[PDB]
Design a protein around this ligand. Structure first.
Ligand SMILES: CO[C@H]1CCCN(C(=O)c2n[nH]c3cc(O)c(C(=O)N(C)c4ccc(N5CCOCC5)cc4)cc23)C1
Length: 209
């Protein structure tokens, strides 16, 4: 059912650095996650040009931002290519190894945490604001999976039994108690206008009722 994995040593080191460094420019996490969603949308868009049946699992190519004050969660949903079990457990972590090592050397050489995206490890900036991150994903070639980590050196992967998503990735940020500003409509709008004004897919902010 649920399998537990150890993060690659370098990624575990980067995650503890992100969690324990005093750094007030935390809003960068949202730019990084939207950029990752844009890359996944680019991939499915590109593949569909030679195989239009890749869009049978959904033609709409977009990003949704869903704050939820009651649950203290910020969800970023996209209809990109999605991730396989191999991506989640091995392949994305393997590729992230060099970028993680390089990023930590750069930080030691005086670089700022905001440069994280230049090293292909932008995702991990989610741990500036989140105590736990849940990622639900569905790739055309595989089953729906749920990845999760509260850091501490491990992550879990399980087959997801929840609502089918067709194709794409849903990033669920379980925010730290002092990071609730990222659930505010005006705050999300400000961040998106400042960092993500030039993304080639519609970004829809879901207003709470
Ligand atoms: C446990 O899950 C996490 C495992 C660690 C890496 N993760 C993310 O970086 C991530 N954050 N938000 C996303 C949204 C998405 O749609 C996807 C996605 O489906 N794919 C295919 C995807 C995969 C890789 C990238 N790259 C961005 C540039 O840096 C090199 C990786 C981009 C999109 C992934 C993410 C996900």
């Amino acid at each position: 059912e649920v399998e537990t994995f150890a993060f690659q040593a370098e990624i575990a080191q980067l995650m503890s650095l992100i969690i324990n460094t005093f750094y007030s420019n935390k809003e960068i996490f949202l730019r990084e996650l939207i950029s990752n969603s844009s890359d996944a949308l680019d991939k499915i868009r590109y593949e569909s040009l030679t195989d239009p049946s890749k869009l049978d699992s959904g033609k709409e190519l977009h990003i949704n931002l869903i704050p939820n004050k009651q649950d203290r969660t910020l969800t970023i949903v996209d209809t990109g290519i999605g991730m396989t079990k191999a991506d989640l457990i091995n392949n994305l972590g393997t590729i992230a190894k060099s970028g993680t090592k390089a990023f930590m050397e750069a930080l030691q050489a005086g670089a700022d945490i905001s440069m994280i995206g230049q090293f292909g490890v932008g995702f991990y900036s989610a741990y500036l604001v989140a105590e736990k991150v849940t990622v639900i994903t569905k790739h055309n070639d595989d089953e729906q999976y749920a990845w999760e980590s509260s850091a501490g050196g491990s992550f879990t992967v399980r087959t997801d039994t929840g609502e089918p998503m067709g194709r794409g990735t849903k990033v669920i940020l379980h925010l730290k108690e002092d990071q609730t500003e990222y659930l505010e409509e005006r705050r999300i709008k400000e961040i998106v206008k400042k960092h993500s004004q030039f993304i080639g897919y519609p970004i829809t902010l879901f207003v709470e009722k």
